[PDB]
Nucleic acid binder design. Structure first.
Ligand SMILES: [Mg+2]
Ligand SMILES: [Mg+2]
Ligand SMILES: [Mg+2]
Ligand SMILES: [Mg+2]
Ligand SMILES: [Mg+2]
Ligand SMILES: [Mg+2]
Ligand SMILES: [Mg+2]
Ligand SMILES: [Mg+2]
Ligand SMILES: [Mg+2]
Ligand SMILES: [Mg+2]
Ligand SMILES: [Mg+2]
Ligand SMILES: [Mg+2]
Ligand SMILES: [Mg+2]
Ligand SMILES: [Mg+2]
Ligand SMILES: [Mg+2]
Ligand SMILES: [Mg+2]
Ligand SMILES: [Zn+2]
Lengths: 101, 55, 144, 72, 143, 124
RNA sequence: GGGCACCACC
RNA sequence: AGCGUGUGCCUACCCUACGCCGGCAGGCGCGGGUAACCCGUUGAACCCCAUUCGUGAUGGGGAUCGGGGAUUGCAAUUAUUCCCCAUGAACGAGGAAUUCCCAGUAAGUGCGGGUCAUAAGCUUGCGUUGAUUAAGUCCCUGCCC
């Protein structure tokens, strides 16, 4: 019995929510205690550049943006069941980190 | 000798210590988030990196 | 029917507390109070020669409202705008050696003590003194 | 032309202040300065003295503007 | 609030004329080499009320102010306040005043000119001295 | 009439060490000396000392040329002939006692003073 | 001869 | 208040709380943060309440210069930047001509990012205070049917 935290980081929300739902369903099918998923504030990286490769013309700017989303799940359980439920969780684009506090 | 003089000038800071990681150009460099690209190379590779234009 | 600090006007409270500190006579005053200005964005020295007591009263009131402030926090509290010639103005902080000496002088009166986390806070004696001053201010305001 | 205002009261100007100002129906440091050829600081000091003596009512006090009136 | 019987409308201090109608703190700033900070610290050191005009002062107060202004280092005025710290020729800290300042600046320029340093040459030619651009500004005063 | 640098004459200056001279100098020279001199400045000092030793008793020392325009003039250099590179030519400078604390580049100008001609067609 | 625009006007 | 940044393949260079020293720029210690966790409840500036000044190129304005001190760097002179005394120029609202703007807008006021060993009078964003005028036309300018 350990307090185990799962942190999920992703760039798109559909895959992230699908993975979170899968983990919650899998854990609750084993009659476990789950807290979350608690959603951290979204991070927005911005890069503003000039469009022209030279210095000629109207001053126009590109505004590129990247969004990072983060979820937390808490589980009171032994390590083996967590790895059992986590093995399926592998999804393209989602970074899953499991820690024992 | 030549071994001492060649490349002796320190290059631990300034424009001469930094260059683009794609074309080795020292002008218009982007250092935010550790990109280390010039603006043209970044505009060329932005979609591959993951920067999208939403506004 | 007990008056607390938040009930009364804050400016009159600061004036009364400064008068109380000056009349007490146990506050320690630096030697250079008459030759210094309070920040680098100020142009002149303070108009009031008994400015040290006023600053000590303000510091005590701030520690009452929000405890645990250090020298940097007090420096940020009393910072203001700096005009610099033909260039745009910018925010500028106060002098650290004044805030530090005000805090030390207040600790010499057994009104301010070191905080466990860091910084300084008020002792129960300092809180009692501030509440008594607030009661006096409220009574003076109501009677007149 | 240049404006040369007195910085310290004279006998005639002090008599003027004591006799005519308390009947102006609108007393203001700018008004007294313009009528008695006095600087603003001396006018403010004189008005504070008259208020202390009780010869003039005060209507409102502000850093920008102080307003006085004659007694009822 | 009435004017005192003995009132000095004009004072003569250090070959300078002082307006007796100005407040004492800003009246003595008419002396070359005395500014608001220095005048205020000198008057605070002389225990003279700052709420009175220059003409209301007695002769004792005026001579005390002059004495304190001439010799700051005796009266606990710090060295960093002075405008002629660490003289090149003799190494003495002091505050220089109306005519002394005028000839001290002249000697400072002459030293640079005689040694033929770049700053002295720029002073001699009449051009800017602290590295400013001269292409577009500073035209005033030139033909 | 006798030269003094901040109340100190030339002989005492020559006797003093670098730590004593740090307090006489200004903030920039003091910081430079506190950070220390490198090999090239020491080589220049050695060459100047060698040149001054070989001077005839009534003659001036041989001119020593250098590119070091950021060299600080020490009291030991007074009386030496230094050619300072300005980018194109070595200008000859005799070190006077009143140059103590300045740089060498302050005495070899790097540009020709402007004498203006008639403005061209492209000026309006 | 019509229509539009605070990179036009009122 | 709000938007954001923060210890980096090469690559050296991060954001800073608290205690002491200095009048200030700064210097010493000793901690947190790879971050809704620490700076940070981001005690911002205008604004508000009192004090002094009193139509005086004035305590408006802060250019140009003198002497000192400290930080970044291998190196500061042709002043990198910063701090302290001192000096105290034009300027009293701007000719012909001409720019931008219709609601949380114009303007005022600060704060982040880029550049950045040192670093904003520029740019790109963010808040805070907050309007006058107009709901029309083809007269000027220009573009289309
Ligand atoms: Mg403030
Ligand atoms: Mg300004
Ligand atoms: Mg003066
Ligand atoms: Mg320059
Ligand atoms: Mg010019
Ligand atoms: Mg119009
Ligand atoms: Mg003036
Ligand atoms: Mg002025
Ligand atoms: Mg200097
Ligand atoms: Mg040049
Ligand atoms: Mg000044
Ligand atoms: Mg137009
Ligand atoms: Mg900005
Ligand atoms: Mg910056
Ligand atoms: Mg630019
Ligand atoms: Mg038309
Ligand atoms: Zn490139």
């Amino acid at each position: 019995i350990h307090r185990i935290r799962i942190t999920l980081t992703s760039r798109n929300v559909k895959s992230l929510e699908k993975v979170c739902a899968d983990l919650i369903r899998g854990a609750k099918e084993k009659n476990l205690k789950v807290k979350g998923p608690v959603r951290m504030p979204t991070k927005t990286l911005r890069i503003t550049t000039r469009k022209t490769p030279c210095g000629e013309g109207s001053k126009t700017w590109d505004r590129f943006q990247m969004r990072i989303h983060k979820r937390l799940i808490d589980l009171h359980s032994p390590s083996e069941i967590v790895k059992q439920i986590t093995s399926i969780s592998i999804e393209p684009g989602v970074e899953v980190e499991v820690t024992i506090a | 000798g030549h071994q001492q003089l060649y490349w002796s000038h320190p290059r631990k800071f300034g424009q001469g210590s930094r260059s683009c990681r794609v074309c080795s150009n020292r002008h218009g460099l982007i250092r935010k988030y550790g990109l280390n690209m010039c603006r043209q190379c970044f505009r060329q590779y932005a979609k591959d990196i993951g920067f999208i234009k939403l506004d | 029917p007990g008056v607390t600090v938040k009930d009364v006007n804050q400016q009159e409270f600061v004036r009364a507390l400064a008068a109380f500190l000056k009349k007490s006579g146990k506050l320690k005053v630096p030697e250079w109070v008459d030759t210094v200005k309070l920040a680098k964005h100020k142009e002149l020295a303070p108009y009031d020669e008994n400015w040290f007591y006023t600053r000590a009263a303000s510091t005590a009131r701030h520690l009452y409202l929000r405890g645990g402030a250090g020298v940097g926090s007090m420096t940020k509290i009393y910072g203001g705008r700096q005009r610099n010639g033909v260039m745009p103005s910018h925010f500028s902080r106060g002098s650290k050696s004044v805030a530090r000496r005000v805090l030390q002088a207040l600790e010499g009166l057994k009104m301010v003590e070191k905080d466990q986390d860091g910084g300084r806070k008020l002792t129960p004696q300092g809180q009692r003194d501030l509440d008594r001053i607030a009661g006096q201010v409220a009574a003076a305001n109501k009677k007149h | 032309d240049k404006l040369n205002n007195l910085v310290l009261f004279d006998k005639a100007t002090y008599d003027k202040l004591c006799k005519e100002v308390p009947n102006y129906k609108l007393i203001t440091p700018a008004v007294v300065s313009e009528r008695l050829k006095i600087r603003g600081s001396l006018a403010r000091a004189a008005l504070q003295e008259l208020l202390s003596k009780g010869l003039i009512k005060l209507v409102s006090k502000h850093r920008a503007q102080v307003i006085y009136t004659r007694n009822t | 609030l009435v004017i005192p019987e003995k009132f000095q409308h004009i004072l003569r201090v250090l070959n300078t004329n002082i307006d007796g109608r100005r407040k004492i703190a800003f009246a003595i700033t008419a002396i070359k080499g005395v500014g608001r900070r220095y005048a205020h610290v000198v008057l605070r050191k002389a225990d003279i009320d700052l709420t009175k005009r220059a003409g209301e002062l007695t002769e004792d107060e005026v001579e005390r102010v002059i004495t304190i202004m001439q010799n700051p280092r005796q009266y606990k005025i710090p060295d960093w306040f002075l405008n002629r710290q660490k003289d090149v020729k003799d190494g003495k800290y002091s505050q220089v005043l109306a005519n002394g300042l005028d000839n001290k600046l002249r000697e400072d320029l002459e030293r640079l000119k005689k040694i033929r340093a770049h700053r002295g040459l720029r002073h001699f030619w009449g051009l800017r001295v602290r590295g400013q651009h001269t292409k577009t500004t500073g035209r005033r005063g030139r033909t | 009439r006798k030269f003094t640098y901040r109340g100190v004459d030339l002989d005492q200056l020559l006797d003093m060490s670098y730590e004593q001279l740090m307090q006489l100098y200004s903030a920039r020279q003091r910081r430079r000396l506190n950070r220390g001199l490198r090999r090239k400045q020491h080589s220049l000092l050695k060459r100047l000392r060698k040149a001054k030793k070989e001077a005839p008793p009534m003659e001036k020392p041989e001119v020593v040329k250098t590119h070091l325009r950021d060299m600080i003039i020490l009291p030991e250099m007074v009386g030496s002939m230094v050619g300072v590179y300005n980018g194109k030519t070595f200008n000859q400078v005799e070190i006077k006692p009143e140059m103590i604390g300045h740089y060498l580049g302050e005495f070899s100008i790097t540009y020709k003073p402007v004498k203006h001609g008639r403005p061209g067609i492209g000026a309006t």
